Every structure is written in C-alpha cells, then in structure tokens.
C-alpha cells in the first residue's frame, strides 16, 4: 500500500476538499509508509472509525498516539506565496512556533519564495 493510495483511502472518509485534514492525511500517510507501517496505520484508523469516531478526530487521535508519528517535525512545503495554500486551509495558518511537531497539531510548514513561513494548525 503506497502513501498515495493510503492518503486516497483516508480521503474517502473526510468531509470537504483540500482541508487541513486532507493535508494531515497526506503527511501521515507518507510517514507511515516510510516507517513500514502503512498497513498498521490503516488498520488502526479503521479500528477507530468502528468505534464511532469519524475521520477528522480519528486522524488527530492517531497523530498523537501512533508510534510512527511521535515527535516527528512537520514537513516544509514550498509555495510561491500563501495565496497558493488551499482556501479551506487559510484560516488554519499560524506563525511558526519554536518547536512544532505533528503530534502537537502542527501539520506542515508552508514556506514562501522568500522564506516567509506559516504553520498549518489542526
């Protein structure tokens, strides 16, 4: 199971499009894949869904409990400017904190052409 297909599977459970949870799904999928745990992550996700939690909460829950994600720093994503960041993510942009980690709600860091930065908070 590729990071791409894992992310797509997660997408099938998420409301809307291009939301911070879609970004989170992509970020987590890549980390899970590289850790040799794409399967275990998907199974853990499915378990949480089966307990009545929907995907947004399941993903934030996994981001703070699943071992592959603990203490991992968010990826930097390059953009021309912050206008490039999808509309449904704009209101979740923040100044970058001292030590952002995924398990504390910091999904990614957007970096503009000039090295101005914003973190995506969930």
Numbering used by the authors: 208 to 329
From the paper:
MARV VP35 RBD was crystallized in space group C2221 with one molecule of the VP35 RBD in the asymmetric unit. Interpretable electron density was observed for residues 208–329 of the RBD. Like the VP35 RBDs of EBOV and RESTV, the RBD of MARV VP35 contains α-helical and β-sheet subdomains connected by a short loop. The β-sheet subdomain is formed by a three-stranded mixed β-sheet and an α-helix, and features the conserved, central basic patch critical to dsRNA binding, that contains residues R271, R294, K298, R301, K311, R325 and K328. The α-helical subdomain contains a four-helix bundle followed by a short fifth helix and features the conserved first basic patch containing residues K211, K237 and K241. The RBD of MARV VP35 is 43% and 41% identical in sequence to those of EBOV and RESTV, respectively, and the crystal structures align with a root mean square deviation (r.m.s.d.) of 1.07 Å and 0.92 Å, to EBOV and RESTV respectively. The location and in general, the contents of both the central and first basic patches are conserved among the structures. The residue F228 is located in a hydrophobic pocket that bridges the α-helical subdomain to the β-sheet subdomain.
Filoviruses encode a viral protein termed VP35 which is important for nucleocapsid assembly, replication and transcription and also plays a critical role in host immunosuppression. VP35 binds to and likely masks viral dsRNA from host factors, which leads to suppression of RNA silencing, inhibition of phosphorylation/activation of interferon regulatory factor 3 (IRF-3) and antagonism of the type I IFN response. Here we present the crystal structure of the dsRNA-binding domain (RBD) of Marburg virus VP35, alone and in complex with dsRNA. The structures and accompanying dsRNA-binding analysis performed by dot-blot assays and isothermal titration calorimetry reveal that MARV VP35 RBD coats the sugar-phosphate backbone along the length of dsRNA in addition to capping at the terminus, suggesting an alternate mechanism of dsRNA masking for immunosuppression.
